């Protein structure tokens, strides 16, 4: 009856990590920005299996930064980096307020943001919240970076496909498009070097 | 005036379509690149049959949905195709002109090209296997794709060169050319104006 | 470990090194890459100026 | 198909698409800078060639 730990949260941890990397997350550079040395902070796929306060500071500041760098500097001016008990409480309060706004704006597709989740950042509920936060940041990037004619791509990705066959086809197309651009990049660099 | 490049791309697409034994091309042998272009990129009932075919190949359940619609309802067919294509991230849901064939030739070629990419998607390794059973459940194919994709992504992100591909930099020029390359906005205008065709 | 001949005028691009790595891991097949080959011409305006200089 | 598999594929599609758009934007900027540099150098070549011919 008796209440079997839903296998559902393991792959979300992995794809979250891929998303951070894809956004340009560098463990050494971002840790240094938070005044912490790499010897004491564990980054990776399992970084929030146990409550990890240090990683929480770094990753969230990074994602907010990637979302709105100007707003990020303004909202955290007086509490970044969280060095004392007073600053820490302010940083958490700020993260919760900002994410609550995002959660209100996006509606039923974004997890409910409760203040208790930030007291001990760790666990499946926390990872689930961070993944959807990372996903949101990527979609904003696709919307910004997508040319006036491809803005529809961000809308299409937001529209949840419930049919597995349709999702597969869409993925195949995306994979191909990536391989093409990767090949083009090689060609342009080669040709430029030769001509020069 | 459909430039020489669009006609060549249309021909390529036409060849790919032939290779995929598209039933709509049965008894139609076009050797003239312009005829091939008019077939693929101008509004016609045939073009719509081809697109319908391409879409039925990518997503088979759509075929039952389209076949139930009477010939007098052509506008509704076009809207259903646009909706699928939107779900595949290829065009906007109101881009009806692209489906009708009124969009720019390049846009049309690129569009049909992408559809074909999906159909000709090298099905990896295992598939020597021939005839057998139709019946295989949609569920086994999805599991395989996920697995493969996971391996690709893992490899892509484990690589030290991955970050460099996201922001490619290349400077092949020696130091002695730097002054030429940093030179005043006026030299740049002279160099770009000299390339205009009448010369 | 195909030791990049230091004397090749064309240094391998990050894209190339990544593609090579993907092919070595069997995650990508050369057939898949070939089917994806874009013949898009690079630097068309520079080429036209070269031809005009020769005729002159 | 467990509602959970369709969500994973969509997440993969999102990652690839993001990478693709990010790469394409940065590649176009390089191509434009490269072609400009080639044209500038080609123009210098053309001036030297004309002067040599006149002297000859």
Swiss-Prot record, chain D:
Signal peptide region: none
Coiled coil: 29-56
UniProt subcellular location: Cytoplasm; Cytoplasm, Cytoskeleton, Microtubule organizing center, Centrosome; Cytoplasm, Cytoskeleton, Spindle; Cytoplasm, Cytoskeleton, Spindle pole
Stated family: Belongs to the HAUS8 family.
Assembly: Component of the HAUS augmin-like complex. The complex interacts with the gamma-tubulin ring complex and this interaction is required for spindle assembly. Associates with microtubules. The interaction with microtubules is strong during mitosis, while it is weak or absent during interphase. It is unclear whether this interaction is direct or indirect.
Functional note: Contributes to mitotic spindle assembly, maintenance of centrosome integrity and completion of cytokinesis as part of the HAUS augmin-like complex.
Protein name (record): HAUS augmin-like complex subunit 8
Gene coding for it: haus8
Residues of the full protein shown: 155 to 210 of 367
């Amino acid at each position: 009856m008796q209440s079997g730990s839903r296998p559902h949260l393991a792959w979300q941890r992995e794809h979250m990590w891929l998303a951070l990397q894809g956004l340009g997350f560098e463990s050494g550079a971002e840790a240094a920005n938070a005044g912490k040395t790499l010897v004491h902070v564990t980054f990776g796929v399992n970084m929030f299996d146990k409550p990890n306060k240090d990683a929480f500071y770094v990753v969230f500041h990074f994602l907010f930064g990637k979302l709105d760098n100007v707003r990020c500097k303004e909202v955290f001016r007086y509490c970044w980096p969280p060095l004392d008990k007073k600053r820490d409480a302010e940083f958490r309060k700020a993260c919760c307020e900002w994410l609550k706004k995002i959660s209100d704006e996006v509606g039923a597709g974004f997890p409910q943001v409760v203040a208790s989740i930030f007291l001990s950042p760790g666990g499946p509920k926390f990872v689930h919240l961070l993944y959807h936060f990372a996903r949101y940041v990527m979609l904003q990037h696709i919307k910004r970076d997508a040319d006036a004619g491809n803005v529809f791509i961000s809308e299409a990705l937001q529209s949840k496909i419930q049919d597995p066959q349709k999702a597969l086809a869409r993925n195949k197309l995306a994979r191909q498009k990536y391989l093409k651009v990767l090949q083009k990049e090689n060609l342009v660099i080669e040709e430029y070097q030769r001509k020069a | 005036m459909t430039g020489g490049k669009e006609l060549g791309a249309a021909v390529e697409l036409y060849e790919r379509l032939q290779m995929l034994s598209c039933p709509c091309l049965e008894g139609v042998y076009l050797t003239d690149p312009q005829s091939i272009y008019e077939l693929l990129c101008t509004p016609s009932s045939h073009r719509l049959d081809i697109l319908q075919w391409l879409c039925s190949r990518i997503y088979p359940p759509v075929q039952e949905q389209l076949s139930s619609l009477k010939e007098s309802q052509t506008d509704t067919k076009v809207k259903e195709i646009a909706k699928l294509c939107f779900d595949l991230m290829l065009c906007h849901f109101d881009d009806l002109d692209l489906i009708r064939g009124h969009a720019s030739p390049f846009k049309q070629i690129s569009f049909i090209g992408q559809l074909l990419d999906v159909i000709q998607y090298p099905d990896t390794i295992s598939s020597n296997v021939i005839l057998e059973s139709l019946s295989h459940s949609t569920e086994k194919n999805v599991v395989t794709c996920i697995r493969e994709n996971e391996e690709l992504l893992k490899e892509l992100f484990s690589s030290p060169h991955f970050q460099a591909t996201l922001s490619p930099e290349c400077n092949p020029w020696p130091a002695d050319f730097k002054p030429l390359l940093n030179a005043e906005e006026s030299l740049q205008k002279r160099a770009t104006q000299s390339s205009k065709g009448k010369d | 470990m195909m030791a990049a001949n230091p004397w090749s005028p064309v240094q391998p691009s990050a894209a190339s090194l990544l593609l090579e790595k993907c092919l070595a891991a069997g995650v990508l097949s050369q057939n898949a890459l070939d089917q994806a080959q874009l013949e898009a011409p690079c630097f068309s305006h520079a080429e036209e100026l070269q031809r005009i200089t020769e005729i002159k | 198909v467990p509602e959970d598999m369709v969500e994973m594929i969509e997440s993969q599609t999102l990652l690839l698409t993001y990478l693709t758009i990010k790469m394409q934007k940065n590649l176009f900027r390089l191509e434009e800078k490269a072609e400009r540099n080639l044209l500038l150098v080609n123009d210098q070549k053309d001036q030297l060639q004309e002067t040599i011919h006149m002297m000859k």
